[PDB]
């Protein structure tokens, strides 16, 4: 499991500072947070939509991240990188 | 047809570069929203319908700073 490995290396999503994001006018708010790590060090964080996917640059690679209805993330990501999802508080 | 969320990483942006990037992005046809985002406040985030992202990036590169790269694309759900 990818969260247990992350927990072993001192990562705790409940203690991560919130992503720096805005809710844009005229589109639905994103209901998931994601946190991106290289060798278990947070590089960035953002928001995404549950039950959906997005494309993002992880290291040197363009990759699809799949987001299930519980904000759990899946996809093929480059060695040394880790991306973890959670429900945005209130959603 | 669907609005896209486009995130562009600015390489080592001054505050002035962030502001200038938001203004130019906002004036592009199809752009409905702009923001500065990311842990390092180094991302221009654009929402738009049918935006030429290659031309937004190219515009940031000639007018604001050398380093601008798409890092996220997410289609908005309705």
Author numbering:
A (entry chain I): 23 to 113
B (entry chain A): 2 to 79
From the paper:
Whereas AVR-Pik and other members of the six-gene AVR-Pik family show specific patterns of presence/absence polymorphisms between grass-specific lineages of M. oryzae, APikL2 stands out by being ubiquitously present in all blast fungus lineages from 13 different host species. The structures were solved and refined as described in the Materials and Methods.
We crystallized complexes of APikL2F with sHMA94 and APikL2A with sHMA25 following co-expression in E. coli for comparative structural analysis. However, we observed that the presence of Asn-66 in APikL2F results in an altered local hydrogen bonding network around Gln-44 in sHMA94, when compared to Asp-66 in the APikL2A/sHMA25 complex. As a result, the side chain of Gln-44 of sHMA94 is rotated relative to Gln-43 of sHMA25, allowing Gln-44 to form additional intramolecular hydrogen bonds with Thr-38 in sHMA94. In this orientation, the NE2 atom of Gln-44 interacts with the OG1 atom and backbone carbonyl of Thr-38. The altered hydrogen bonding network around Gln-44 in the APikL2F/sHMA94 complex, compared to APikL2A/sHMA25, appears to firmly lock Gln-44 in place compared to Gln-43 of sHMA25. This suggests that the interaction with Asn-66 of APikL2F results in reduced flexibility of the sHMA94 loop in interface 2.
